[PDB]
Curated annotation (Swiss-Prot):
The chain holds residues 396 to 800 of 938 of the full protein. Component of N-methyl-D-aspartate (NMDA) receptors (NMDARs) that function as heterotetrameric, ligand-gated cation channels with high calcium permeability and voltage-dependent block by Mg(2+). NMDARs participate in synaptic plasticity for learning and memory formation by contributing to the long-term potentiation (LTP). Channel activation requires binding of the neurotransmitter L-glutamate to the GluN2 subunit, glycine or D-serine binding to the GluN1 subunit, plus membrane depolarization to eliminate channel inhibition by Mg(2+). Glycine binds at residues 121, 123, 128, 177, 221. This is Glutamate receptor ionotropic, NMDA 1. It comes from Rattus norvegicus. Glycans are attached at residues 45, 76, 96, 163, 260. Residues 152-289 are extracellular. Disulfide bonds join 25-59, 41-60, 233-287.
């Protein structure tokens, strides 16, 4: 009767921290002085490779955890939370050198029944929606560009992007959905020729490169980038959001929970719950002084 929830490590939607020796979560508080709600999430012990605990209890919290808690109380279900084993959101890939394709990441865990519900900043798109159901979006999604403050880029149609040169370096994260999407679009091939020269192994490295003036612009999720930029006085996002969609809760097709998850989200938009989440989680009060 208890739902298996899969989520993924992605601040500020889901923070992942160790439990204490007792197996409890450290008591912490929000800017408003409310207790941070924390759940126990088991997941791959990436922090301690070599540990005899391969799958380890950890403390999860953030925007998506508050939202999970709201859903559970509103729809009266119990749950246990785990972090996706391969650390991925989910793409469809050929397996075993055949023509059979399988989803990995959280998409795969949902389809195989290792998860009953995906609660994460999971981007709604047409290909995913062929295989699962999304709720109404709890938050809107798009890409944006991270730059040093002062750098002016209008957005995706900016000439320094559309007509690239070594004078203005931009990039994204290798093997991310952004990377995979860009590399397959005829319309983006000129941009991609530039980007594949500069793509970074991880978002954190790319963000640091922008601070270090080693990368001029980083193309990534706008929620992640706006969160990161708010921490740093010398970092800003710039240009119009682009390639937009929304984040939704994911469930298997014809799930008995789908309508109720959507109604709960619509209620939360209307009553100010979602806006309160945005206030609590999404932006620093001010840049580091
Ligand atoms: O559903 C997603 N959500 C994502 C949210 C933030 C950053 C990357 C995300 N992502 C990637 S890469 N691939 N799928 C996703």
């Amino acid at each position: 009767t208890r739902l298996k929830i899969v989520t993924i490590h992605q601040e500020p939607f889901v923070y992942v921290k160790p439990t204490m020796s007792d197996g409890t979560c450290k008591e912490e508080f929000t800017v408003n002085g409310d207790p941070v709600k924390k759940v126990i999430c088991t997941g791959p012990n990436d922090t301690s490779p070599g540990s005899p605990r391969h799958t380890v209890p950890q403390c999860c919290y953030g925007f998506c955890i508050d939202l999970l808690i709201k859903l559970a109380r509103t729809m009266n279900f119990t749950y246990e939370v785990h972090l996706v084993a391969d650390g991925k959101f989910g793409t469809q890939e050929r397996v075993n050198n055949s023509n059979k394709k399988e989803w990995n990441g959280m998409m795969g865990e949902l389809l195989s029944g290792q998860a009953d519900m995906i609660v994460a900043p999971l981007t709604i798109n047409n290909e995913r929606a062929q295989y699962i159901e999304f709720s109404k979006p709890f938050k809107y999604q798009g890409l944006t560009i991270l730059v040093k403050k002062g750098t002016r880029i209008t957005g995706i149609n900016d000439p320094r992007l559309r007509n690239p040169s070594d004078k203005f370096i931009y990039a994204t994260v290798k093997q991310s959905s952004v990377d995979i999407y860009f590399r397959r679009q005829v319309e983006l091939s000129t941009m991609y020729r530039h980007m594949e020269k500069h793509n970074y192994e991880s978002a954190a490295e790319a963000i640091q490169a922008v601070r270090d003036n080693k990368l001029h612009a980083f193309i990534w999720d706008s929620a992640v980038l706006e969160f990161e930029a708010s921490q740093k006085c010398d970092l800003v996002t710039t240009g119009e959001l682009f390639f937009r969609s929304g984040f939704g809760i994911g469930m298997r097709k014809d799930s008995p929970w789908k309508q109720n998850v959507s109604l709960s989200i619509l209620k939360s938009h209307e009553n100010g719950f979602m806006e309160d989440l945005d206030k609590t989680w999404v932006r620093y009060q001010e840049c580091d002084s």
